[PDB]
DNA sequence: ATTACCGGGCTCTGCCATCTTA
DNA sequence: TAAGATGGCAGAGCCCGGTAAT
């Protein structure tokens, strides 16, 4: 009876919560009060708590014992309570979507057995907390898939390919094997692509391509190809460009296009752009801002070394002063 | 003294469909 | 036989600066 009343004083968005997990509002007993006190005990603010419950109401059905034990387990990896509060504020999901603290502990044990340092586990938990609410079996499937993928390519020891991939791509363990697989084949088919260069790309600059949802990478590449084609770039140039800078794939089509256009409207050549791909790191606002200042000075941009467009504020602002 | 090369940091959460489970 | 547990989807960059090269 008191549920809807307490949720209110807690400042919970009751309507949003009702829509997310209706079943929680039909339970006879709930522990919203204990949860609030528990989360307060560990630094969480009243607003954070309200936000947490609004998003994952089932949170209020956990007991003081489970909560405390789960938290303790996380503290085997994360060095402070505050670090755990921030993770839960980001997404309540990993912490609250399971009450199975045995599975959690097995996940921790299994990851250690994979050869991962506690520092790495901390990295995994902080970046991809949801790794730890996966079933052990799900985490096993991915690790196996990765070993199998490692040796199916030219890797001297798969067990170490796994750890490299996990370090560069903390999110790898919260992707389906279907998704990752599709992204590897995309890369393999689309480009060259010998195993040795595939490995490097995968454990390096192109690591997060493997986390890309279905058809997103193929579609992004096809737009890049078209856009660059219409601009007089050959296929080999496009390939070279994307491989020298796979981050470009993460941009939305319109953003990529808009960014190319905003540069070339100031008469920077497409050749200048793709030979200095990092200029594509700066936002359209930042590029426009700097382009104004540069042309606002003696600069012609057509013959200027445009690398500065993507330099840190400090280094850019310095070069700009000198330029006057 | 200045630019090139290059890696690292942030936050990547929140929804829904399908099973398990009691 | 409804909730809880679980898997898996779609989501759509920008910035800084240490160190090597010049």
Swiss-Prot record:
Changing residue 216 to A: Reduces affinity for cognate DNA. It is found in: Mitochondrion. Changing residue 179 to A: Strongly reduces transcription termination. Changing residue 97 to A: Strongly reduces affinity for DNA. Strongly reduces transcription termination. Phosphoprotein with mostly four phosphate groups. While the DNA-binding activity is unaffected by the phosphorylation state, only the phosphorylated form of the protein is active for termination activity. Functioning seems to be regulated by phosphorylation. GO terms for molecular function: double-stranded DNA binding; nucleic acid binding; RNA binding. GO terms for biological process: DNA geometric change; DNA-templated transcription termination; regulation of DNA-templated transcription; termination of mitochondrial transcription. The record marks 90, 130, 171, 216, 278 as: Interaction with DNA. The keyword Transcription regulation applies. Disulfide bonds: none annotated. Residues 97-98, 175-179, 252-259, 283-286, 312-319 are annotated as: Interaction with DNA. Changing residue 130 to A: Strongly reduces affinity for DNA. Strongly reduces transcription termination. GO terms for cellular component: mitochondrial matrix; mitochondrial nucleoid; mitochondrion. Keywords: DNA-binding, Mitochondrion, Phosphoprotein, Repeat, Transcription, Transcription regulation, Transcription termination, Transit peptide. Transcription termination factor. Binds to a 28 bp region within the tRNA(Leu(uur)) gene at a position immediately adjacent to and downstream of the 16S rRNA gene; this region comprises a tridecamer sequence critical for directing accurate termination. Binds DNA along the major grove and promotes DNA bending and partial unwinding. Promotes base flipping. Transcription termination activity appears to be polarized with highest specificity for transcripts initiated on the light strand. Monomer. Belongs to the mTERF family. Contains nine structural repeats of about 35 residues, where each repeat contains three helices. The repeats form a left-handed superhelical assembly with a solenoid structure that wraps itself around DNA. This is Transcription termination factor 1, mitochondrial. It comes from Homo sapiens (Human). The chain holds residues 73 to 396 of 399 of the full protein.
